[PDB]
């Protein structure tokens, strides 16, 4: 089974800057045929549901502001945050859809 | 975009009795041209990332109890937990992905009477 694992657990970036966030995959979860990256990201706030940021690793999904942007291919994939807002304080997952069982990685914390 | 509701958004439930939990979509989910049902199912501990339990609404996980069973179609879904145990207690939603912007629910807590 495909395990996600994220680095760091936790970050603390000032207001106005670069955040980046890591994902590696035991296995890759690029479709060959296709190649799309089965790969998403998610943020989530405290007593609310996961929001999906981004699809394919790198589509942004619908309402999603634009300084949210994903990248990578295969194994290794990054979540980044051009210009940190006080509102992007959340937690950050990645998740896998390529092959089932279906997983998401572990969680990173983001705060100023 | 379509928006999911769940309900109850908290519930109590007894060792080993079962334990249902309803989700309404704002427009069918469900895909004339295939016949199914873009509608998922999660659990969510404290401190964990969620869970896939169901997807398709009712086809269950590998790795998952045959005690979590998914029903329902187009706007109707169910998510029902036989035999409970306790350590069922979790945070539970739907998600569709039918259309974009894919979402969750709002979350229902399951905690143990």
């Known amino acids: 089974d495909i395990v996600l694992t994220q680095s760091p657990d936790s970050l603390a970036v000032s207001l106005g800057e670069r955040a980046t966030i890591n994902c590696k995959s035991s296995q890759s979860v690029l479709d060959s045929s296709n190649s799309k990256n089965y790969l998403a990201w998610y943020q989530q706030k405290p007593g609310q549901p996961p929001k999906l940021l981004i699809y394919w690793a790198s589509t942004r999904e619908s309402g999603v502001p634009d300084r949210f942007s994903g990248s990578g291919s295969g194994t290794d994939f990054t979540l980044t945050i051009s210009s940190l807002q006080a509102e992007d304080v959340a937690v950050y997952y990645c998740?896998?859809?390529?092959?089932?069982?279906?997983?998401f990685g572990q969680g990173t914390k983001l705060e100023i | 975009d379509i928006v999911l509701t769940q309900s109850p958004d908290s519930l109590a439930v007894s060792l080993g009795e079962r334990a249902t939990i309803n989700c309404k979509s704002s427009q069918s989910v469900l895909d004339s041209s295939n016949s199914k049902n873009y509608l998922a199912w999660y659990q969510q501990k404290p401190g964990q990332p969620p869970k896939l339990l169901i997807y398709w609404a009712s086809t269950r996980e590998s790795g998952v109890p045959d005690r979590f069973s998914g029903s329902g179609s187009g706007t109707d879904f169910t998510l029902t937990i036989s035999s409970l145990q306790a350590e069922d207690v979790a945070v539970?939603?739907?998600?569709?992905?039918?259309?974009?912007?894919?979402?969750?629910?709002?979350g229902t807590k399951l905690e143990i009477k």
């Open positions: 998740d896998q859809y390529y092959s089932h069982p279906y997983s």
